[PDB]
Symmetry: C3
Subunit: 313 residues, 3 copies
C-alpha cells in the first residue's frame, strides 16, 4: 500500500504572480484527498504550511525575496523530513517551484540516496549570478547540486541549505525553454536530460525506459518526482505562470507518472505551479486543476488500463 | 473491389441520452454513401432498421430497457447475416454500442471464425451483475464471450443470444476508463488489449502490428471492427455520450483503419455512438460527424498518401 | 556561422486568395530578422522583390495567371542565385508555393547537386494537364522534375525553365491530400515520401533518419527545404489557403527543422503559404505567424534543449 503525506505549500514569492499560493486550495476542493482514498491509498494531511511573512526582504543583488523564499523552503524541508520519518510518500501541493529547494532537501535528510526526475519546460538551474530575471523559481536546482557549491554566493535566507544531490542523480524531462548559462551548466556538469527534441525523437516510452535505467542503474533507490505543471503543453495546463508551447501531452504526462508508480520507488512528489488566477476563463482553471489531479492520481496507482481489488468480481 | 452493405441502426435505449438514434441520419446527409461511391466501392443501402417500440419494458434487476435492447440487436443480427450472405461487408451506422451484440452475432452466424478489433475508451464488458449503471451499451462484450456463459443471467430480450467468440478472438484499442470488475475480467480471461498506456509506450504503428499478428496469427480470417467514436479524443469527436480525455488522435484513428483496410480482411464494421445532440455548438457536431465519416472512408480504401485508378494519368 | 540571405517574395497569383502576398510583411514585423540576429546568424536582407504586374495574362488551357507566375519565379530564381553566389543560405519568405519553381531553380543554378525536402500536406506535382483546379501553387514540382520533361506543355511565362532535379533527389514529408494523377506520378517516378501514414507508423524521429540517409546517401550535398505552412496541422497554422486536418504537430515541425539544421547542409529555405487575411481571428493570424517564425529559427540553430556561446558562463 502507498501511504502518502499531504503537505500544502501556499507560497508564491519565488516568482512575481501571487495566484499560485492558491494551488493547495483548489487542488483540495477538486477532491484530491477523497480521490486518493478512493484508491487503496493511506492518506494523511499535514495541512497547509502557515508561511512566515517577511516584510523586510530587499533583493540580494538581482535575487528577489530571498529571505521569504529561503525561509519557506527551510520550513518545508523540516515537514517533508517529518512525513518521510513517518514512512509516507511526501506529496507537496505547491505554489511556485522555488519550494523544490526545501522539498528535495528535507527528502534527502531522510534518504540521502534519492534520485530526482524533474518534469519541466525549464531547467530551473540558474544561479544567483546567471539568472537575468532574479526570480527564485528558476533557480532551485542550482542550490541543490553539490558540483555547483562554490558558484552560489551566500544568499540571505539559505544558510541552512547544503547541496544534497550530484549532477548525475537528476534527469530532466520536457525541456523547451533553457537559458544560455543554464545550457552551459547542463553540458558542463553532464546532466542527463530529455528535452522536447528527445521526446519527439525517441517517444515517451523509450524516454521513460532510459530515465529509470539511468537513475536506478547500479541500485534501486528512492525516487523524487518534482512535477512542474508547465512541463505539459499550455493546452492542458494553461493556468500557470511560465507557459511554453510544444509541451508534453496529457497522455505523455500520465505515461510518465504511471511508469514512475510501477517502479514502487516513488518517495517524494512535487505538484507545482498551478495558478488558478492565471486562467483566461473558468474552464482553463478547471482544465489545469483536473490535469494536475490526474497526474497526481497516476503517481499513486490509478492506471488507464483499469484497476481491481484482490477479490473475485 | 470492396462491396459494402449499409445498415442504418437508429437505436438509443442502450444508454440514457436519445440523440444517438440520429447517427444514421447525419452520417448519410454528410454524404457517406456518395463519398464511398466516389471510391471504387460497391455500395448497397439496406436502410434504417425500423426498430420496435417496447412500452412495457421494466428493468431486470439493475439492467435498463433489456427487451428493447435485446430486440434491436436480434433484429440487427438478422440483417447483418443477410448482407454477409450477400457477399458484402456490413457497415452498421449505429446509435449506442449495445447494438454490437446484434452486429457481431449476425456476422458470426455467417463467419463463425471472425476476429474482433474493438476501438473504445471503454471495454463494454460489464455483466448484468457487474454493471453499476445498468446501461447496456457498457455490456455488449459480456453477452458475446463464450467463457462468460454461466455468469450472465437470463435477461429478458436476449434468449436468442449465444456467445459466438472466445476471449482470445478479441483485441481492444484505446482503453482509458475501465471499471474494476471489467479489469478483473480482462486479466482473468486473458483478453489482449492496448490501453492508452500501451499506445503511448509502443506507438500506434507497433500497436497495429501486434494487434493484426495476434488475431491473424495461425490463419487469415474475417475481421470485425467495432468502432466506438469515444475511442478518439473528445477534441475530435465531442458529440458522444461518454467522452474521456487523453484519447486516440485523429491520425491514430485513421492509421488504425488504414491498416485494417490493407489486410483485405475487413468483413464487419460498426461506426457507433455519434450523438449530434450532444455537441456544445454546431461545429462540434460537424467535427464529430466529419471524423466519423473519415474513419469510415479509411476502412474502405481512402489513403492519406493518395489513391489512383489502373490507368495511365 | 550560418549566413542567411532574406528574400521577400510578396506573390499570390499561384492561387486564388490574395492575402498571401502579405507573408513577408507580417513575418518581418514579427521580428524575424531581429530574432535571427539574436542568434549567431549573419543576416542580409535583399528586400521584398517588386513583382511585375501583368494585366494581359489569360489562362493557358486551364492554367491561371501563367505569365505572372512564370515571371515571378523567373525573377526570384535570379535573386536566389545571387545570394547563393554570395555564400549565404537563401531564405525565401513567400506568398504561394508556385514560387518554389523560381526558388529551387535559382538554387540549382549555383548548386546543381542539391537535394530537396518538401514539407507539405500536398505533393504540388500536378502537371498543366493533370491539374483540375488550374492553380499553379499545386504544380511547382512538375516543372522541376527532369523525368517529367515531355509531359509539360509550353506554358506562357516558363520558357526560361529547365528541370533541375531528378525524382530521386526529392523527399516529401506530411502528405495527406494527394490527387489521383499526383499519386500515379509518385508511384511511377518512384518518388520517396512520408505521408502522414508513415509519420504515424514510424515516428518523426525515424522519418527524419530515413529522409536524410536517403538524400545524403552516396555523398553530402546542399539541402533545399521548401516548407509549406499547411504541412502542419491547422490548429497551429490556420491562416493558410489550403488547410488539411490531421497534420504535423508543432513539435514534429520543430523536430524536422532542428534535424535539418544539425546536418550543417541547409542551403535553401522556403517559408510559404502564410496568409494572415485567412485567420478567423486576430490570434489565429498570430498563431500562424509565430509558428512560421519558430520553424524558421529552428532551421538556423535555435534548439529546444538550449543554446550557449563558447564562453564560461
Ligand atoms: N529561466 C527563466 C524562467 C524559469 C521558470 C521557472 B519555473 O520552471 O519554475 O517555472 C528564469 O530564470 O527566470
Ligand atoms: N463502464 C461504464 C461506461 C460504459 C460506456 C459504454 B460505451 O463504451 O458504449 O460508451 C458503464 O458500464 O456504464
Ligand atoms: N492538389 C490541389 C491543391 C494543391 C495545393 C497547393 B499547395 O500545396 O501549394 O498549397 C490542386 O492541384 O489545386
Ligand atoms: Mn517551468
Ligand atoms: Mn519549474
Ligand atoms: Mn466508449
Ligand atoms: Mn463502446
Ligand atoms: Mn500545401
Ligand atoms: Mn505547397
Ligand atoms: Zn515557476
Ligand atoms: Zn456508449
Ligand atoms: Zn498553396
Amino acid at each position: 500500500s502507498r501511504t502518502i503525506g499531504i503537505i500544502g505549500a501556499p507560497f508564491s514569492k519565488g516568482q512575481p504572480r501571487g495566484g499560485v499560493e492558491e494551488g493547495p486550495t483548489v487542488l483540495r476542493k477538486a477532491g484530491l484527498l477523497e480521490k486518493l482514498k478512493e484508491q487503496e491509498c493511506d492518506v494523511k494531511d499535514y495541512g497547509d504550511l502557515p508561511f512566515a511573512d517577511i516584510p523586510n526582504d530587499s533583493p540580494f543583488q538581482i535575487v528577489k525575496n530571498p529571505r521569504s523564499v529561503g525561509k519557506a523552503s527551510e520550513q518545508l524541508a523540516g515537514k517533508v523530513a517529518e512525513v518521510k520519518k513517518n514512512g509516507r510518500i511526501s506529496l507537496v501541493l505547491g505554489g511556485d517551484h522555488s519550494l523544490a529547494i526545501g522539498s528535495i532537501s528535507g527528502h534527502a535528510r531522510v534518504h540521502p540516496d534519492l534520485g530526482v526526475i524533474w518534469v519541466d519546460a525549464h531547467t530551473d538551474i540558474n544561479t544567483p549570478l546567471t539568472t537575468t530575471s532574479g526570480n527564485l523559481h528558476g533557480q532551485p536546482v542550482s542550490f541543490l547540486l553539490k558540483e555547483l557549491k562554490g558558484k552560489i554566493p551566500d544568499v540571505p535566507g539559505f544558510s541552512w541549505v547544503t547541496p544534497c544531490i550530484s549532477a548525475k542523480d537528476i534527469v530532466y524531462i520536457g525541456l523547451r525553454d533553457v537559458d544560455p548559462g543554464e545550457h552551459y551548466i547542463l553540458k558542463t556538469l553532464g546532466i542527463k536530460y530529455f528535452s522536447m527534441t528527445e521526446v519527439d525523437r525517441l517517444g515517451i516510452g523509450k524516454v521513460m525506459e532510459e530515465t529509470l535505467s539511468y537513475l536506478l542503474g547500479r541500485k534501486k533507490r528512492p525516487i523524487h518526482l518534482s512535477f512542474d505543471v508547465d512541463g505539459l503543453d499550455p493546452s492542458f495546463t494553461p493556468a500557470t505562470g511560465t507557459p511554453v508551447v510544444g509541451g508534453l501531452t496529457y497522455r505523455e504526462g500520465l505515461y510518465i507518472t504511471e511508469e514512475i508508480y510501477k517502479t514502487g520507488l516513488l518517495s517524494g512528489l512535487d505538484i507545482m505551479e498551478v495558478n488558478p488566477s492565471l486562467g483566461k476563463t473558468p474552464e482553463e482553471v478547471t482544465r489545469t486543476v483536473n490535469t494536475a489531479v490526474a497526474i497526481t492520481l497516476a503517481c499513486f496507482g490509478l492506471a488507464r488500463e483499469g484497476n481491481h481489488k484482490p477479490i473475485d468480481y
